[PDB]
Each structure stands twice: as C-alpha cells, then as structure tokens.
Amino acid sequence: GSDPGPEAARLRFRCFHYEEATGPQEALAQLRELCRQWLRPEVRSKEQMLELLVLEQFLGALPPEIQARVQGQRPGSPEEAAALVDGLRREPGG
Amino acid sequence: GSDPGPEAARLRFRCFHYEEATGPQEALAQLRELCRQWLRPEVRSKEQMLELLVLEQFLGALPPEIQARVQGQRPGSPEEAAALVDGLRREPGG
C-alpha cells in the first residue's frame, strides 16, 4: 500500500545505464517505465511534471561539487534543492 | 511573436548553466518557464511529457561521445534518438 516515491523512482531512472545490449529502443521501454513510476500521469498532473523536470536540469546545471552536495541528500523538489544550494553558494565550505 | 518550440525550448533549458549570481530559485523560475515552453501543459498532455522526459534521460544515459552526436543533431524524440545511437554503436563510432 506504500509507494517507493517519485524521487526514488527517478533515481532508479537515472541509475539506468545506457546499455547497448538491450538496444536503445528497449532501453526506452525501461526508461519510459521508470520515468512513468516517477511522473505518474495517473496521479500527477502536467504542472507537477514541470516541477520534477525543473529539478532535473537544475541539479545537473549545478557544478559537480554543489551537485554532489544535493545528491548526497536528495531533496526531490527544485526549491528544496535551491535551498540546499542557496547556502552552498555562500562561500564553498558548508 | 511565438514560442521557441519544444525542441528549441529544451535547448535553452539544457544550455542553461547554473549561475549563483542569478540565484537557484530565480534560475528555477527561468527553468520552470523554459521547461514549460518545452513540455507545455497548455497544449500537451502528461504522456507527451513522459516521452519528452524519457528522451531527456536517454540522452544523458548515453556515453559523452554518443551523446555529443545526438546533441549535435537534436531529434527531440526518444525513439528517433534511439535510432541514431543504434547506428553510432555500430562499430563504436559509426
């Protein structure tokens, strides 16, 4: 009755390495499946998908060191990530 | 006057570098806007967002060299990307 969580599902979604062995189209079927367990059109609407995806680019837009700090906590929401980094940009050392 | 288009919107969205000077939450506002110009709940539905976002991760799941090729052409559709990468992996490099 519990769900893994959208953030956990997204982690699995990105933990997926592109493997030529399964073929890119078949890999898509995996990614599509994994992203679907994260986005979930069934329960989430389009604007919520925006939020999740904003977070997505935002994290990778961060420098490796700041990004690692996020990745070491995993907020799952863009503004939370923003708040993590908001302090990290205040002279690296926190 | 028009929208950049979902394909170009993702470009602007991915070309966005995190700049501490604009702040993460202000950057979010830009990203939230850019991703919205890409996903567009206004015109598109959730499953379209699934697809666009599968593409997004699929490209990053690819190795830097293969990813660079996709990034240089920009299909915008996951299966289309799957098609070039399937070719790029034919005799690693093409």
From Swiss-Prot, chains A, B:
Modified residues (Phosphoserine): S77
Free-text tissue specificity from the UniProt record: Preferentially expressed in differentiating myeloid cells. Detected in osteoblasts.
Induction, per UniProt: By retinoic acid.
Residue ranges of every copy of the SCAN box domain listed in the record: 10-91
Record localization: Nucleus
Quaternary structure and partners: Homodimer.
Family: Belongs to the krueppel C2H2-type zinc-finger protein family.
Function: Binds to target promoter DNA and functions as a transcription regulator. Regulates transcription from the PADI1 and CDH2 promoter. May be one regulator of transcriptional events during hemopoietic development.
Name listed for the protein in its UniProt record: Myeloid zinc finger 1
Gene: MZF1
Segment of the intact protein contained: 37 to 128 of 734
